[PDB]
Design an enzyme around this catalytic site. Structure first.
Site, PDB file in Angstrom:
ATOM      1  CG  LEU G  40      -0.981   0.244   2.833  1.00  0.00           C
ATOM      2  CD1 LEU G  40      -1.307   0.625   3.384  1.00  0.00           C
ATOM      3  CD2 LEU G  40       0.606  -0.659   3.477  1.00  0.00           C
ATOM      4  CG  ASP G  41       1.127   5.963  -2.151  1.00  0.00           C
ATOM      5  OD1 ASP G  41       1.411   6.710  -0.890  1.00  0.00           O
ATOM      6  OD2 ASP G  41       1.573   5.777  -3.176  1.00  0.00           O
ATOM      7  CB  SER G  42       4.198   6.341   1.341  1.00  0.00           C
ATOM      8  OG  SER G  42       4.141   7.686   1.248  1.00  0.00           O
TER       9      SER G  42
END
Ligand SMILES: CCCCCCCCCCCCCCCCCC(=O)OC[C@H](COP(=O)([O-])OCC[N+](C)(C)C)OC(=O)CCCCCCCCCCCCCCCCC
Ligand SMILES: CCCCCCCCCCCCCCCCCC(=O)OC[C@H](COP(=O)([O-])OCC[N+](C)(C)C)OC(=O)CCCCCCCCCCCCCCCCC
Ligand SMILES: CCCCCCCCCCCCCCCCCC(=O)OC[C@H](COP(=O)(O)OCCN)OC(=O)CCCCCCCCCCCCCCCCC
Ligand SMILES: CCCCCCCCCCCCCCCCCC(=O)O[C@@H](COC(=O)CCCCCCCCCCCCCCC)COP(=O)(O)OC[C@H](O)CO
Ligand SMILES: CCCCCCCCCCC[C@H](O)CC(=O)SCCNC(=O)CCNC(=O)[C@H](O)C(C)(C)COP(=O)(O)O
Lengths: 173, 459, 57, 172, 75, 99, 86, 606, 64
Positions: G40-42
């Site tokens: 998942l994205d930061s």
């Protein structure tokens, strides 16, 4: 009681006649009746037992009088002995006149509460009585300083008829 | 007196020849006993001052101070006996000798009948105190503090000595009685002006008045606790006792000349309490607090009205018992942490539960709630000052508002907060400390029931 | 019970109350020196009690 | 230390979202405005120029600062929260127990005996923590506020006493 | 699941509080009884006029008997 | 070195030796007697017995006597119809004003 | 109420992550590091702890929040903060 | 002299018994809270009796007792004054403090110092009782300072909370500014009237007490938290819920308005000052209510609602309506106290959550608590024939039929409409909506103590408005003949306030993006008051304390003018008169001059 | 410890007399003292002149 009405005038009470037309009983009669039979009666019983116990051994006490002594208006200047006798008597007269105002204040305070709403006019006689006391007490003792003495009281007194003599002589014209 | 002075003097050889370790015991025994004897003088007759001998007499102003001083004597013993238990027997005996001697001068001073005899012992109190602050002090500024305290008191007292003997040559005897019954009008004149200034400055410095007060933050803070009380709890009132007696002759020049002193005290008391609002030493906090209360006594004397004199003595006694208490409070922490900075030891209610309670009533008495004797004194002065001038209630009340902030300030900073993490030497309070604190506050709240005893010579 | 020890450490205790007795004694040793006007103030001037030697000591 | 840009923008996202909580109130409104907030953040994600990223931040921080709720919602167990340090006034330090009277000490023999074991354990391991520190100090004093762990076996982590034996957050 | 409650040692404070309750009351009750017992057995005096020949020596000019007793001795 | 002095030794924990330590001195037995003397010769007889003595002292600076002297002066003055307390303090008839 | 216990926290932990549609239910190991496998994205982990922040009624400071990256870590930090000691 | 004298006075003595019992430790430490509650309950039922002879006989008492001092010509002594305002306030105060004490058991069931907390509450009740029962101004000051300090400890009850001490410091700070006028009235009433008893002051008829009443007004403003001295009440929410529910709702902040009620007979003689009272109440009503609506904490909303109420009460006092204010005292006392532990019940149930945002879905989740809230909220509005009606809209009708200060009248009408506004916010967000709290719901109000406490007060809101109004003797001027249009405006403004507040609150349901209005900002941070007030003069006064005062003047100037300059003067020539070079020639040459100047030059020969 | 020194002792030895400090000493010092002197003296003169003529009346004020 333990005093006379001539010193503390309390006008005779005016209690109404409770006649409740409504059939439902008045509760305030019931709590008053139970209060007498549950608290007031034992208190009276203990009091009368206390009073008779005191009455068995009666020790008496009297009141101290101070015979009139020459004051400072006839006290010779630098006469230290007559200075003391005059000064002590004046301060004793100071204490009694302080209590004289104290009595009048108590009557005035009694005048307020006793009349309740009608305090304004029912005992205005109390108000004017205190007016006479306070005004005269002002020219008699007020503004004498924390080191007041009979010499100072004459000094303040002497200022009055001296001013009065000038005024009346001016008034006579 | 002889019936209090002689037992006081006889404590001196008793303590010196007492047992090695029983010195603290026996001295505490009879000092409490002598205080009990001095309770006999709390009665006063109608108007004439209680006279025993030619050189000694008492009135409704000296006796309330006499009992305060003799009652204080046990308190300094227990408070100081903590750290004094770690030196030579002679050194500890010398201290108890010096408190006994210091108290001896105070008892004889307050009942002095001749003004010269009053001045001799009034200034003689310097020697026992000066050595206390210097020899047994626990800092370095004490050396400068002792000089400041000695020179300020002496520089004002010396004009009094010249002024006092001048009354002797001109008027005659200087007995407090013959002065009163032979009061003459001190008319306004430049020679009389300096006569007024000399007879007043000596007592003003020991109040202290705003500006002649920098000796107090140095003397009181650096002094040992056995001293830190008396320089704040009795001998400041000794200057007060001087004012209320010497002003018998200074009329009517006092009202014309009082203006610089009134404005200095009435305005400076706001500034002094403002120092307490931002301080770093707990002892200095209470020290400047004493200046504000004494400044209120300074203005109180000078109106010379029946109400002011009563509120003068009421605050004078109440503050002494109060300011003595706070110095005990600061002592307890200063022993545990070995520093006087306020923020160093934040959080005491968490660790010491009853110490907070004693701190609560201690800071409350200074807060002067009704009917505490502090309030019964300050309130009387406010009414007397208001009758003198309506504007002064702005200044008088402003301190009453300001004094609430700082009086509760050390309560918040020290007690009400998170305990300091690094400190780890706090111990459960010794039963001596709590017993001493009760000896301070119990008479104060008990005195609330009958203020007539301490109300002064004009009740 | 080893009375020597008691009089070695508690002989100091009696030293104060005897001083108080001395203080009272000197007060009543001195007051009669200030007799002068005894029953002479016209406020307290009163006819002496019959079978009593004198008024206030 | 030096807070890099990707951390700071994350701080903005976390704090701004908590601020619109105080604004959106209703959950469905939250989830809608959060998604617009979320995607409007992701639409500009290919800025090879780091200066332009701060230029995008040049209006966001003021956008947050004037759109912030004057009464933002913070959980009570936190600064500004209604229950911040509410139960702190019972956090009596554990070393105070050493001053308990023996009668109270004997009131809890098991806990006090175990306290002795911990005290003995702390005494033994203290010097072990001490030399561990100077065995791996950075040349020039401790560079970072961080604290190295226990490298070898039978060694407690350096400077562990206060962290491990801290009072519970709910002391009562 | 009950657990320890790390609190400051109040035993010495309890000792101090208990001791006054024992010491301030050691002479507390007997005087309190004495004050009450005096007021109910020997009782309070009553106002009386000056006798024909008896001047009220010193302590006589007082109401309370214990207050009179303090006036008898001492003052 | 400069100076040859022993440092601050310690703050002796007076509670450590005797757990019931009283905070007055090192030696327990005399210290135990120390409350027995400060409490007995303190609270008991100069606080309790002290209060009862001062609180029950013979009346101080006579007031109820002065309170007493009020009623007969006012009762006499109001009954015969004379102002209850005169404006002048000292008798003015024997005053000899200047000229 | 009974204290929030370790088994109670973790059961509530993957309660939220599986309730997240961005994570497939099957790949939910208790030590599944968010960046490694779930990918998942930061930005996303910053928005998931807020749900956890509301879930247990606490705050996860940004100083610790950015390091918190495992379901085991999330239950670890919450348990350590609220004195969870079985 | 009936039992109405002795029995009413012993009510205080029953109250102070637990305080003495606490130090003896005979009380079982487990059941001390039960000891306190049933003690107050006994005093409450004992305090009912003073009522029955009040309606029946219409008698009032003044009980003076042991003399404190015969100070000059004043007789300062303990004294009590039973009257219309007194004999009923204690039953209301005792009933309220009994209900919360029962509630306090359930709420504070985990505080380790619970015995101490109940001890503080009784001490406050004793101080408040002697405040409402006082005959001399000094005795009135005993309570006037006793409740203030008691608030300080109770507000800082949680102790370690850093900001709680600030509010505790704030509460005493604003109180002391209020006490400024109290001591001003003390001095004036003692100087120009030579007393402090209310009886003498009224008899002396100080028909023009300009400065006293101004000081009297200033005493109320500090204690009643009026405009200019309000913000300590909102900051007092930092204390525990029962702490504010008792003190800062209906039994301590009442002191300020109650003081004017005591001095009402002297109030009517003056005209200028009484206008300032209704003027101060008017601004206080709006500004507190204006900041009330836009708050997001349940405790703050009720706090501002209270201060809005006391603003209304002084509006009544303005135009010669003192007793109607006391009627407003009792009616406000009942339901306002209820709203606080209704909030307390939901706060404790929702794991100490007070933010009005994390609420919703409580109408069916908490039936009785929601039911009590609607009753309390409706009492705030003043629904007809309910507790609110018997006081509030009677005032609004009374204020309409009077020679008011025009702009003062309008603000109350805006205020009473504003009362419904924040009332919806409480009901809307907290109950009428979908749940927003943390997932683990701990909602529970089944505890008997919680139910019994609210139930006892709740019946006091359905009734006791009709009961008291009918029972009290008719003694106010009745406004019988008014034009219709302003007769029921109180119902119009509330319904109008209800309608638009609901629409604006429901507007949040609309998905429309929110725009932060600057007017909303002004309302939300409390009229910008705290950040100017509680930051600027505090800095300036403290700044003057350090750079000036402590430094400069002291420690520099006062030390360099008198002491150090004299030291320097004594020193500069000390270096000189001690530096004789030791040469014999110089010494003997100085002898020559000293010889020469003395013999003839000074004319010392003659 | 440095802070306590800087606020207590390291002030006068580091004090340098300058017109800024000199003026501030007078303005914050003698200034307000004379200000209160003028205000109170004027009120006392106002009060003293008024009761001499007979303007204020204290018919009930006795204690002072
Ligand atoms: C049942 C309860 C009873 C309670 C009684 C009331 C409380 C009693 C409290 C006693 C202690 C407080 C008062 C101490 C008085 C100290 C003596 C004093 O004032 O002067 C010395 C007094 C008075 O000084 P004097 O001796 O010069 O007085 C001469 C005049 N005659 C003789 C009439 C008294 O000394 C004496 O009276 C001598 C006898 C021994 C007194 C011992 C006193 C200390 C022990 C008690
Ligand atoms: C009839 C008698 C009934 C019992 C009375 C018992 C006592 C009482 O309550 O009296 C009430 C009386 C009330 O007086 P009263 O005028 O109401 O009359 C009494 C009788 N009744 C109450 C029935 C009407 O007041 C006092 O006695 C005043 C008590 C003051 C106590 C002061 C204690 C001071 C202690 C100081 C110790 C330290 C000394 C050193 C330091 C000094 C300061 C620097
Ligand atoms: C003649 C009779 C007139 C009667 C008038 C009655 C007015 C009643 C009050 C209306 C305005 C206040 C209101 O409706 O408040 C409720 C609400 C709160 O909105 P907000 O706090 O922004 O929270 C939004 C969360 N999503 O919605 C809001 O819009 C809040 C608005 C805040 C500002 C209100 C300012 C009111 C000013 C009134 C007059 C003051 C004197 C001039
Ligand atoms: C440290 C500085 C001083 C601090 C503050 C001290 C108090 C301020 C006043 C200073 C003067 C105190 C000395 C007072 C002496 C007795 C005063 C007195 O009784 O009044 C006499 C007046 O006193 C004086 O005349 C002297 C005092 C006035 C000031 C002059 C001397 C003092 C100032 C210088 C020395 C002190 C200053 C310190 C110097 C280093 C009345 O006598 P007379 O002048 O009427 O004599 C009869 C006839 O008319 C002619 O003599
Ligand atoms: C709805 C109401 C809202 C009210 C409140 C509104 C708050 C402000 C809204 C406007 C915000 C503004 O558009 C953006 C800004 O703040 S700054 C520029 C962002 N540009 C970069 O950061 C590029 C560099 N990239 C990285 O730092 C990493 O890539 C990142 C951490 C982003 C992702 O990590 P990975 O995945 O790559």
């Amino acid at each position: 009681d333990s005093w006379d009405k001539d010193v503390y005038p309390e006008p005779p009470r005016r209690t109404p006649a409770p006649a409740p037309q409504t059939s439902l009983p008045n509760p305030v009669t019931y709590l008053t009746k139970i209060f007498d039979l549950l608290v007031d009666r034992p208190v009276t019983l203990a009091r009368e037992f206390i009073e008779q116990q005191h009455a068995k051994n009666r020790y008496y006490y009297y009141h101290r009088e101070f015979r009139r002594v020459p004051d400072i208006t006839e006290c010779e200047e630098k006469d230290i002995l007559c200075m003391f006798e005059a000064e002590m008597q004046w301060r004793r007269d100071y204490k009694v006149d302080q209590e004289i105002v104290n009595i009048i204040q108590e009557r005035l305070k009694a005048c307020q509460q006793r009349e309740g709403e009608s305090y304004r006019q029912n005992c205005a006689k109390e108000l004017e009585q205190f007016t006479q006391v306070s005004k005269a007490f002002q020219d008699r003792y007020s503004d004498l300083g924390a080191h007041y003495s009979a010499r100072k009281c004459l000094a303040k007194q002497k200022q009055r008829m001296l001013a009065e003599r000038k005024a009346a002589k001016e008034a006579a014209a | 007196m002889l019936k209090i002075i002689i037992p006081t003097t006889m404590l001196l050889p008793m303590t010196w020849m007492s047992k090695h370790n029983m010195i603290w015991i026996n001295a505490t025994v009879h000092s409490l006993l002598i205080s009990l004897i001095s309770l006999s003088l709390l009665n006063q007759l109608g108007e004439n001052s209680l006279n025993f001998s030619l050189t000694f007499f008492s009135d409704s102003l000296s006796a309330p101070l006499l009992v305060l001083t003799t009652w204080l004597l046990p308190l300094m013993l227990m408070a100081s006996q903590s750290h004094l238990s770690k030196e030579t027997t002679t050194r500890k005996k010398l201290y108890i000798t010096m408190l006994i001697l210091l108290q001896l001068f105070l008892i004889m001073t307050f009942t002095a009948t001749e003004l010269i005899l009053f001045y001799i012992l009034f200034e003689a109190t310097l020697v026992p105190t000066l050595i206390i602050i210097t020899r047994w002090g626990n800092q370095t500024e004490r050396l400068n503090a002792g000089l400041y305290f000695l020179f300020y008191t002496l520089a004002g007292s010396l004009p009094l000595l010249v002024a006092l003997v001048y009354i002797q040559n001109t008027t005659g005897s200087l007995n407090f009685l013959i002065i009163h019954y032979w009061s003459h009008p001190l008319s306004n004149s430049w020679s009389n002006i300096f006569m007024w200034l000399a007879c007043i400055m000596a007592f003003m410095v020991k109040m202290p008045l705003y500006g002649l007060h920098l000796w107090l933050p140095k003397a009181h803070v650096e002094a040992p606790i056995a001293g830190s009380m008396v320089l704040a709890a009795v001998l400041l009132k000794l200057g007060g006792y001087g004012m209320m007696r010497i002003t018998t002759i200074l009329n009517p020049l006092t009202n014309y000349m009082a203006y610089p002193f009134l404005m200095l005290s009435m305005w400076g008391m706001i500034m002094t309490s403002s120092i307490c609002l931002r301080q770093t030493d707990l002892k200095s906090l209470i020290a400047y607090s004493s200046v504000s209360h004494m400044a209120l006594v300074i203005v109180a004397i000078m109106i010379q009205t029946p109400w002011s004199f009563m509120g003068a003595t009421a605050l004078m006694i109440a503050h002494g018992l109060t300011s003595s208490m706070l110095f005990c409070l600061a002592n307890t922490n200063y022993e545990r942490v070995h520093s006087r900075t306020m923020i160093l030891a934040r959080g005491l209610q968490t660790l010491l539960p009853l110490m907070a309670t004693w701190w609560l009533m201690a800071s409350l008495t200074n807060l002067a709630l009704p009917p505490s004797i502090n309030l019964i004194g300050e309130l009387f002065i406010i009414t007397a000052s208001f009758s003198w001038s309506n504007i002064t209630i702005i200044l008088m009340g402003m301190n009453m508002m300001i004094t609430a902030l700082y009086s509760l300030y050390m309560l918040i900073t020290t007690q009400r907060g998170k305990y300091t993490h690094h400190i780890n030497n706090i111990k459960a309070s010794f039963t001596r400390e709590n017993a001493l604190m009760a000896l301070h506050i119990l008479p104060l709240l008990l005195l609330t029931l009958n203020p007539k005893m301490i109300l002064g010579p004009l009740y | 019970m080893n009375v020597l020890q008691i009089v070695r450490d508690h002989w100091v205790h009696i030293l104060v109350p005897v001083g108080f007795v001395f203080g009272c004694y000197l007060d009543r040793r001195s007051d009669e020196k200030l007799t002068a006007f005894r029953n002479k103030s016209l406020l307290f001037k009163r006819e002496l009690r019959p079978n009593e030697e004198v008024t206030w000591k | 230390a030096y807070l890099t840009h990707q951390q700071k923008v994350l701080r903005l996202y976390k704090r701004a979202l908590r601020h619109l909580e105080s604004w959106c109130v209703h959950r469905d409104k939250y989830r809608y405005f959060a998604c617009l907030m979320r995607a409007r953040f992701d639409e500009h994600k290919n800025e090879k120029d780091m200066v332009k990223a701060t230029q995008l931040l040049r209006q966001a921080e003021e956008e947050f600062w004037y759109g912030q709720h004057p009464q933002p919602y913070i959980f009570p167990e936190s600064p500004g929260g209604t229950s911040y340090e509410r139960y702190e006034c019972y956090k009596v330090p554990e070393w105070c127990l050493d001053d308990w009277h023996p009668s109270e000490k004997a009131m809890y023999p098991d806990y006090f005996a175990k306290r002795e074991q911990w005290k003995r354990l702390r005494r033994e391991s203290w010097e072990r923590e001490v030399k561990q520190l100077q065995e791996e100090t950075p040349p020039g004093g401790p560079r970072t506020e961080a604290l190295p762990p226990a490298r070898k076996e039978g060694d407690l982590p350096p400077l562990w006493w206060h962290i491990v034996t801290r009072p519970r957050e709910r002391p009562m | 699941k009950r657990l320890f409650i790390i609190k400051p040692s109040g035993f010495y404070d309890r000792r101090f509080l208990k001791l006054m309750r024992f010491y301030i009351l050691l002479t507390g009750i007997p005087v309190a009884i004495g004050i009450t017992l005096v007021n109910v057995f020997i009782g309070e005096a009553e106002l009386a006029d000056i006798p024909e020949g008896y001047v009220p020596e010193h302590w006589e000019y007082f109401k309370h008997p214990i207050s009179r007793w303090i006036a008898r001795t001492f003052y | 070195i400069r100076l040859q002095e022993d440092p601050d030794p310690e703050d002796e924990n007076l509670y450590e030796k005797n757990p019931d330590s009283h905070g007055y001195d090192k030696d327990p037995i005399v210290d135990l007697w120390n409350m027995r003397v400060v409490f007995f010769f303190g609270f008991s007889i100069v606080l309790v017995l002290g209060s009862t003595f001062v609180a029950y002292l013979p009346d101080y600076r006579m007031q109820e006597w002065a309170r007493r002297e009020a009623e007969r002066l006012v009762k006499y003055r109001e009954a015969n119809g004379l102002p209850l307390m005169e404006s002048n303090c000292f008798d003015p008839n024997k005053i000899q004003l200047p000229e | 109420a009974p204290p929030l216990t370790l088994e109670a926290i973790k059961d509530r932990v993957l309660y939220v992550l599986k309730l997240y549609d961005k994570i497939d239910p099957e790949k939910l190991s208790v030590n599944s590091h968010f960046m490694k496998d779930l990918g998942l994205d930061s930005l996303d982990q910053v928005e998931i702890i807020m749900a956890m922040e509301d879930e247990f009624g606490f705050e996860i400071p940004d100083i610790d929040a950015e390091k918190l990256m495992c379901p085991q870590e999330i239950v670890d930090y919450i348990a350590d903060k609220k004195d969870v000691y079985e | 002299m009936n039992p109405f004298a002795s029995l009413t006075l012993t009510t205080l003595i029953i109250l102070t018994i637990p305080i003495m019992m606490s130090n003896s430790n005979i009380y079982k430490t487990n059941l001390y809270p039960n000891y306190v509650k049933t003690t107050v309950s006994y005093a409450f039922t004992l305090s009912l009796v003073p009522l029955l002879m009040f309606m029946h006989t219409g008698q009032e008492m003044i009980i003076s007792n042991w003399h404190w001092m015969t100070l000059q010509t004043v007789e300062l002594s303990l004294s009590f004054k039973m009257d219309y305002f007194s004999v009923m306030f204690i039953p209301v105060a005792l009933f309220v403090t009994w209900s919360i004490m029962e509630f306090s058991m359930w709420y504070m069931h985990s505080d380790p110092f619970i015995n101490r907390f109940f001890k503080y509450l009784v001490l406050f009740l004793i101080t408040m009782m002697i405040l409402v029962t006082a005959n001399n101004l000094f005795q009135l000051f005993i309570g006037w300072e006793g409740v203030g300090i008691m608030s300080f400890l109770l507000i800082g009850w949680w102790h370690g909370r850093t900001d709680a001490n600030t509010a505790a410091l704030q509460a005493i700070l604003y109180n002391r500014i209020g006490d400024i006028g109290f001591v001003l009235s003390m001095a004036w009433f003692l100087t120009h009237s030579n007393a402090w008893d209310l009886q003498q002051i009224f008899m002396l008829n100080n028909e023009c007490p300009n400065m006293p009443l101004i000081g009297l007004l200033l005493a109320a403003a500090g204690k009643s938290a009026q405009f200019g001295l309000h913000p300590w009440l909102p900051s007092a929410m930092e204390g525990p819920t029962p702490v504010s529910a008792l003190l800062h709702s209906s039994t301590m902040v009442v002191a300020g308005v109650f003081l004017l009620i005591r001095f009402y007979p002297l109030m009517e003689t003056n005209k200028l000052v009484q206008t300032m009272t209704l003027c101060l109440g008017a601004i206080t009503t709006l500004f507190t209510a204006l900041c009330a609506i836009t708050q997001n904490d349940i405790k703050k909303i009720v706090a501002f609602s209270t201060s809005s109420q006391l603003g209304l009460m002084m509006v009544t006092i303005g135009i010669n309506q003192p007793h109607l204010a006391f009627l407003h005292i009792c009616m406000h006392a009942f339901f306002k106290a209820m709203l606080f532990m209704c909030s307390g019940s939901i706060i404790h149930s929702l794991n100490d959550e007070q933010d009005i945002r994390k609420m919703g879905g409580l109408y069916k989740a908490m039936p009785f608590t929601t039911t009590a809230l609607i009753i309390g909220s409706l009492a705030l509005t003043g629904m007809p024939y309910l507790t609110g009606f018997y006081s509030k809209d009677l005032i609004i009708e009374a204020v309409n039929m009077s020679y008011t200060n025009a702009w003062a009248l309008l603000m109350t009408l805006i205020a009473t409409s504003l009362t419904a506004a924040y009332s919806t916010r409480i009901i809307f967000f907290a109950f009428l909506g979908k749940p927003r709290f943390p997932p683990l719901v701990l909602i529970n109000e089944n505890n008997p103590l919680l139910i019994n406490s609210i139930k006892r007060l709740l019946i006091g809101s359905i009734f006791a408005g009709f009961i008291i109004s009918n029972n009290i003797p008719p003694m106010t001027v009745p406004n019988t003949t008014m034009p219709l249009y302003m007769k029921m405006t109180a119902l119009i403004v509330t319904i109008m306030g209800f309608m638009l507040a609901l629409e604006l609150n429901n507007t949040t349901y609309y998905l429309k993006f929110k725009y932060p209005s600057q007017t909303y900002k002004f309302s939300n941070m409390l009229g910008y008051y705290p950040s100017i007030m509680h930051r600027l003069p505090t800095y300036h006064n403290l700044s003057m304390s350090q750079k000036s005062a402590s430094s400069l003047l002291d420690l520099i100037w006062l030390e360099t003018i008198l002491p150090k300059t004299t030291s320097f003067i004594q020193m500069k020539m000390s270096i000189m008169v001690s530096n004789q070079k030791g040469l014999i020639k110089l010494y003997f040459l100085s002898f020559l001059i000293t010889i020469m100047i003395s013999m003839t030059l000074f004319n010392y020969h003659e | 410890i440095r802070w306590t020194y800087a606020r207590s002792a390291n002030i006068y030895p580091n004090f340098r007399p300058t017109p800024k400090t000199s003026l501030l000493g007078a303005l914050f010092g003698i200034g307000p003292l004379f200000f209160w002197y003028y205000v109170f003296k004027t009120d006392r003169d106002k009060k003293e002149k008024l009761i001499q003529e007979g303007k204020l009346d204290q018919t009930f004020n006795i204690s002072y």
